[PDB]
Structure formats: structure tokens, C-alpha cells
Amino acid sequence: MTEIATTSGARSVGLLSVGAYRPERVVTNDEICQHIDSSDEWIYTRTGIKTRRFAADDESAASMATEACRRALSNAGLSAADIDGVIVTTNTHFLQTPPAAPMVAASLGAKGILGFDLSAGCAGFGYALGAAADMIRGGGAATMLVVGTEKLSPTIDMYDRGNCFIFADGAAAVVVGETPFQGIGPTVAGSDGEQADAIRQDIDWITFAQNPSGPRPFVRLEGPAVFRWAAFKMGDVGRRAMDAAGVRPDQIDVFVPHQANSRINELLVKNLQLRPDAVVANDIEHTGNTSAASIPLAMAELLTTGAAKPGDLALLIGYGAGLSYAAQVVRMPK
Amino acid sequence: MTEIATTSGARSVGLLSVGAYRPERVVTNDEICIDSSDEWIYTRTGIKTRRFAADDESAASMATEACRRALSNAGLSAADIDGVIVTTNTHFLQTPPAAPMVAASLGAKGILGFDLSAGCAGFGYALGAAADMIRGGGAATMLVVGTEKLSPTIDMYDRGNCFIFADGAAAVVVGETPFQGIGPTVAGSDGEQADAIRQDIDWITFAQNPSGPRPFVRLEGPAVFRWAAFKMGDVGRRAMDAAGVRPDQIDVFVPHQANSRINELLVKNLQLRPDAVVANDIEHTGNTSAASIPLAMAELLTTGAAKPGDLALLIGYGAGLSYAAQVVRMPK
Numbered sequence: 001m002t003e004i005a006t007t008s009g010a011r012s013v014g015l016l017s018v019g020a021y022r023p024e025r026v027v028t029n030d031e032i033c034q035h036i037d038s039s040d041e042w043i044y045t046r047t048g049i050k051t052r053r054f055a056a057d058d059e060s061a062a063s064m065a066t067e068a069c070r071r072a073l074s075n076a077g078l079s080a081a082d083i084d085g086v087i088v089t090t091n092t093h094f095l096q097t098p099p100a101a102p103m104v105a106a107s108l109g110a111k112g113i114l115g116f117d118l119s120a121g122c123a124g125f126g127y128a129l130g131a132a133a134d135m136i137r138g139g140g141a142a143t144m145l146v147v148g149t150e151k152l153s154p155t156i157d158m159y160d161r162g163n164c165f166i167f168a169d170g171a172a173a174v175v176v177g178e179t180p181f182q183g184i185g186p187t188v189a190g191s192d193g194e195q196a197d198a199i200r201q202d203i204d205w206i207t208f209a210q211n212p213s214g215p216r217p218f219v220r221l222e223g224p225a226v227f228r229w230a231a232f233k234m235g236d237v238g239r240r241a242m243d244a245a246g247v248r249p250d251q252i253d254v255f256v257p258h259q260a261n262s263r264i265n266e267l268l269v270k271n272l273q274l275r276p277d278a279v280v281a282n283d284i285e286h287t288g289n290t291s292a293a294s295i296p297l298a299m300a301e302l303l304t305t306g307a308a309k310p311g312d313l314a315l316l317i318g319y320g321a322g323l324s325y326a327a328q329v330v331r332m333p334k
Numbered sequence: 335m336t337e338i339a340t341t342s343g344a345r346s347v348g349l350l351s352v353g354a355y356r357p358e359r360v361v362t363n364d365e366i367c368i369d370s371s372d373e374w375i376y377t378r379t380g381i382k383t384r385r386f387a388a389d390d391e392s393a394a395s396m397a398t399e400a401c402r403r404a405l406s407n408a409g410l411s412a413a414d415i416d417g418v419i420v421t422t423n424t425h426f427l428q429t430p431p432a433a434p435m436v437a438a439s440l441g442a443k444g445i446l447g448f449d450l451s452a453g454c455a456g457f458g459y460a461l462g463a464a465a466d467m468i469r470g471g472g473a474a475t476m477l478v479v480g481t482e483k484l485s486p487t488i489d490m491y492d493r494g495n496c497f498i499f500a501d502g503a504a505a506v507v508v509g510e511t512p513f514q515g516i517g518p519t520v521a522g523s524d525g526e527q528a529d530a531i532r533q534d535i536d537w538i539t540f541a542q543n544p545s546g547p548r549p550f551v552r553l554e555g556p557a558v559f560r561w562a563a564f565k566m567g568d569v570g571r572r573a574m575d576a577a578g579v580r581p582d583q584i585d586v587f588v589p590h591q592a593n594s595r596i597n598e599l600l601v602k603n604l605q606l607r608p609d610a611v612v613a614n615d616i617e618h619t620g621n622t623s624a625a626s627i628p629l630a631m632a633e634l635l636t637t638g639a640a641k642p643g644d645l646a647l648l649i650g651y652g653a654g655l656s657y658a659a660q661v662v663r664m665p666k
């Protein structure tokens with residue numbers, strides 16, 4: 001009797017730019033050997049990390065996202081008024097509400113634009129990019145920001161000899177809009193809810209809030225279990241992502257896995273059967289693991305250093321918390 | 335150089351089914367006092383009773399229950415679903431996310447998913463994101479579930495809001511339909527009013543100073559009333575417009591169940607048919623935030639007021655100052 005209208009947008013969409021923010025404070029391996037019993041040698045060998053970035057007390061996941069978003073637009077040659085919507089992916093927004101997106105949009109002077117927060121561990125970016133590209137193609141928006149942002153510092157147990165030296169702070173943003181040629185492939189994603197406990201906050205905020213003066217929550221990590229899972233399962237994931245995009249492994253110029261751990265990633269590369277000269281992102285060396293923020297920060301570093309060029313066929317695999325993953329083939333931004 | 339494939343899913347996508355979960359325990363107006371009354375609370379809010387989830391229940395647990403039912407009503411098993419989006423404001427864990435757990439609990443542990451946070455516009459956005467993913471080729475059928483557990487967030491001395499919030503979850507199955515079943519998403523926000531609805535103290539600042547006060551949900555009634563009542567009429571007009579439907583065509587208005595008086599003014603402004611049906615689940619459900627709309631859809635469908643395939647305007651509004659709207663067809 002009646003018909004609901006249907007819309008459509010751009011066919012091809014891509015990473016118009018990347019913009020990275022990294023906090024002033026550089027915390028060395030040595031400067032954590034205080035509260036733990038190990039060396040710089042030890043930490044570096046098992047993780048790949050040399051130094052990491054720590055945000056200041058007044059800095060936040062939303063402030064850092066804003067400064068990243070600000071830089072992204074500059075690199076894309078656009079102002080806030082060109083943006084139709086922003087998606088924030090984070091694990092360290094410390095308010096159940098309000099969301100971060102609207103605050104960010106307002107900070108940048110695009111106060112009324114659409115936006116939500118996407119939470120999916122370190123698969124957030126892959127999912128957010130997916131949703132963005134999907135929204136623009138459907139005609140929901142034309143140009144979008146997607147920003148991985150993280151203030152992990154406050155959640156570290158400085159005595160937790162298993163993960164204290166892994167997490168760090170930062171934010172990086174990309175611009176997604178119409179492009180001459182297809183620049184973002186299909187999103188390949190999934191989960192493993194059974195191993196949800198592998199990466200977690202040990203105490204929920206409500207339990208804690210009812211008994212405040214007792215032990216406070218921290219980020220907890222079952223290393224071995226997350227290693228085995230990432231290293232033995234993401235190899236296939238990436239192949240599903242290349243297969244979807246219709247690309248051979250030997251065509252990937254740039255590998256940007258989530259910066260969880262250097263050993264893991266090394267193993268992922270060998271598995272994926274890439275070219276001997278594919279550029280594998282290793283930002284983790286001086287950035288540390290920045291969760292949902294890692295992939296875009298990885299991209300930015302590879303471009304800043306000139307090891308990757310704009311237009312390079314890249315493969316992104318995000319993996320981590322909740323045991324979730326998201327992957328896709330893209331063209332390098334900027 | 336080298337091509338990247340351009341894929342495409344099914345063009346037309348709708349709501350196959352709705353499924354609701356509401357906790358056992360009924361908390362009556364009387365069972366909460368501040369300095370108020372049954373006739374006081376019903377006048378400003380439209381609430382009579384609300385439901386509270388038990389101490390062993392969660393956002394995630396209710397979501398699963400809701401999904402499981404949505405799945406039953408769809409005539410589908412968890413193996414038919416390609417992904418789940420959980421929209422919530424009360425999953426009290428920074429990580430891991432709720433979606434894979436719900437996925438695990440449903441018995442489809444492998445499927446994709448995430449948590450989408452956008453105040454009470456969460457559902458509008460999550461529905462949008464779903465249809466978009468299905469139309470794009472990344473999923474054939476999906477669950478969108480709104481879940482909420484606001485009981486522990488409420489401050490019993492807050493004469494402004496303590497009687498407003500409740501617990502509950504409701505999910506929908508989205509998938510290929512003979513005709514277009516989800517209108518174009520119409521959304522936006524007002525960042526400059528982020529504090530209108532907020533958690534007064536962040537979790538870390540609280541954790542670093544536990545001898546101070548604990549966080550609670552704080553609300554600026556007046557500012558939230560002005561905004562919602564006098565802006566969301568336009569949003570409704572923009573959503574009906576995108577859907578290529580006239581106001582006088584709408585069978586069912588389902589605004590977010592924030593406040594009956596807000597929603598009362600909205601209906602007048604929207605200039606719908608005298609016989610348009612208005613979501614009032616709030617009377618006995620209360621404000622369940624990101625879950626209100628699907629709950630209201632299920633309540634209307636259970637009640638007979640809304641039939642399957644009715645034309646329904648959805649308008650989600652709330653925290654962050656975020657809004658999301660669409661014209662959908664009624665499921666089941």
C-alpha cells in the first residue's frame with residue numbers, strides 16, 4: 001500500500017587521510033623497571049617495545065581523539081564543515097554516558113554532526129571503518145571521521161608483571177569519503193566469546209563502586225592464551241580479507257596488524273605468505289600497544305617515515321579483547 | 335596497479351521480528367521515597383511502575399534473553415545470524431565488549447559484533463549500521479539488541495530522576511525482505527550540551543579517590559525537555575521525508591520512552607493522524623534508555639495497538655545529546 005524510500009551513495013570510498021596524536025611524555029623500558037623485576041633487554045625481546053607514550057592528567061580519550069581528528073582533516077585538505085559524521089572507537093572512555101563522539105564533534109566545531117562510539121576491543125577500528133564505508137555507500141553520509149583513541153595509562157597495574165609494560169596512550173584518525181578507485185574492501189570480521197576472560201577488566205565498575213575502599217579494577221591479560229589465539233587464527237582471517245577484496249597475498253604492499261606484540265605479528269607475516277619486501281608496521285617499538293588506536297597510528301608512522309606511500313595496497317587485521325577480530329584490504333591514506 | 339572488489343548485498347532489508355525481556359520484580363512508585371507521590375511522579379513523567387533486574391542479572395544477560403526471543407519470533411536459530419550489535423549505556427566493563435559474550439551465550443560464538451554507544455539514539459544508529467552492513471554485503475541477517483541495567487546507576491536521593499530509569503532489553507532480527515523495511519537513517523547531535531545527561535564522576539577519577547562520592551546518573555530535566563520537545567519534531571519530519579512518506583501515512587509513532595510529557599508534545603508537533611498510535615510502554619516499563627524503542631515496539635505488538643507491517647516512525651533521543659530516526663515497517 002505504501003513504499004519506504006531507498007537511498008544510495010558513493011560506490012568507491014577510501015582513506016583520504018590519516019592524522020596521528022602522540023602525548024609528550026616518553027616512558028622508557030627502564031622507567032618501569034622500578035616497580036617490576038626485569039630489564040630493558042627482557043621487555044623488548046618478548047614485546048618489541050622500546051618506549052611508550054603517556055598522556056597527561058588533563059588529557060583524555062576524547063581530547064586526544066579531537067587533536068587526531070583535527071590533523072586528519074588537515075591532511076585530507078578539509079575543514080570540519082565538510083564532515084558529515086564521526087565514529088569514535090575506544091576502550092578507555094570512562095563514562096557510561098555521554099558518548100565521546102558528540103563532544104569531539106563539538107570540539108572541532110562540527111557540533112551537530114552524527115556520531116556514536118564503537119566498542120570492540122582492538123577490533124574497533126576494523127569495525128568502525130567497515131561501518132563508515134558502509135554508511136557512505138548506503139547514502140547515510142558522504143564524508144566521515146573514524147578515530148581510534150585510548151588512555152590506557154590509568155588502567156595499568158604497575159605491579160602486574162604480565163602486562164604493565166604493554167599498554168600506552170594516543171589517538172589517530174582517518175577520513176573516509178568518495179574516491180576515484182575502490183579504496184576500502186569488504187570487512188571480514190568475527191569473534192570468540194568463550195575466551196572473553198583472556199583480555200578484561202577484572203572488576204566491573206558497579207561491583208567496585210559498591211565496595212570502593214577494596215581492590216580497584218585494572219586491565220588483566222592472559223598472555224599465553226592471547227598469543228596462541230592471535231598467532232594461530234589471524235593468518236586465516238587475513239586470507240579471508242584478501243580473498244574478499246579479490247587480491248593475492250603477493251599484492252599486499254603494507255601489513256598493518258594491531259600492535260599487540262612484535263612476536264605475534266612476525267608470526268602472522270610468515271603465515272600470510274607475503275612478498276619478501278612487504279612493509280610490516282612496527283610502530284609498537286616507540287608507541288607501545290594502544291589498542292583500538294594502534295592500526296591508524298601504525299598507518300601514520302609508516303607514512304611519516306616514508307616506508308609506505310599513499311596508494312599502497314595494505315592489509316589491516318585487528319584482534320584482541322572479547323576475542324573479536326576485524327580485517328580488510330585498503331589503500332594507504334594521505 | 336591492482337583492483338579492490340566492489341561487493342553488494344540485498345537492496346531491501348527489514349525487521350523480521352521483535353523480542354523483549356523485562357525482569358520479574360515490579361518496583362511501584364510507592365516503593366521509592368525524597369518527598370514525592372504516585373500522582374506527583376505520574377504527572378511529570380507518565381510512569382506508574384517500572385521493573386528492576388536482579389543482582390545476578392546484567393546488560394549482557396538480558397540482551398541474550400531478548401535476542402533468544404527475537405530469534406524465536408523470527409522463526410530462526412542462532413546459526414542463521416551473521417552478527418550481533420549490542421547497544422547499551424550500562425555495560426559496566428571498559429573491556430571485553432558485550433556482543434561476543436551475547437554471541438557465545440546464544441550458541442553462535444563465532445559471529446561478528448560490537449557495542450555501539452550513542453545515548454538513547456543507540457538503537458537508531460545500531461539499526462542503521464545493521465541494514466547498511468546487510469545492504470553492503472557484510473552480513474545477510476543480523477540481531478540488533480538494546481539492553482539496559484540502570485538500577486545500580488540511580489541515586490535514591492536524586493529527586494530529579496531516581497523514579498525515571500528502569501531495566502530491560504529488546505532485540506530485533508534484521509534481514510532480506512520482499513520490500514524496503516528500514517527507512518534511511520536521519521541522525522545528528524548537540525555536543526555543546528554533553529552535560530545535560532551525564533555520569534557526574536568518571537570511573538578513574540572515582541577509583542583514584544574512593545573516599546569521595548561515587549558516580550551516579552545525573553540529568554538536567556529542563557534542558558533535556560526543551561531540546562527533545564522542540565527539536566525532535568524536525569528530526570521526525572526529516573526521517574519521514576527520507577522514507578518518502580507523509581506524516582498522515584504513519585500508523586505508529588515510537589519515540590524514545592524518556593518522558594510521556596515530552597512525547598505528548600512531540601505527537602502534537604509531528605501533525606500525525608488523530609488515530610496514530612503512540613508508544614507509552616513507559617507507564618509500566620519506565621525509561622529503559624537504549625532499550626525503550628524495541629521494548630515499546632514489542633509492547634505495542636503484544637498489546638494489539640500495532641499490527642505487523644504498520645508504518646512506524648522511530649525517534650531516539652538522549653545523552654551526549656544524540657538523535658537517530660527512521661521510518662520502519664512493523665515486524666513479527
Ligand SMILES: *SCCCCCCCCCCC(=O)O
Nearest residue numbers: 122155201217218219320428
Ligand atoms: S584490545 C585491548 C583491550 C584492553 C584495554 C581495555 C581498557 C582497559 C581495561 C579496563 C581496565 C580498568 O580500567 O579497570
Ligand SMILES: *SCCCCCCCCCCC(=O)O
Nearest residue numbers: 096423454487533549551652
Ligand atoms: S539516554 C539515557 C541516559 C542515561 C543512561 C546512561 C547510563 C547511566 C549513566 C551512568 C551512571 C553511572 O555512573 O552509574
Ligand SMILES: CCCCCCCCCCOC(=O)S
Nearest residue numbers: 122223226260261319320321
Ligand atoms: C611475556 C609475554 C608478553 C605477553 C604477550 C601477549 C600479548 C597480547 C597483548 C594483546 O592485548 C591487546 O591489546 S589485544
Ligand SMILES: CCCCCCCCCCOC(=O)S
Nearest residue numbers: 531555556559592593652653
Ligand atoms: C521541565 C520538566 C522536567 C521533567 C523531567 C524530564 C525527564 C528527562 C528524562 C531523560 O530521558 C532520557 O532518557 S536521558
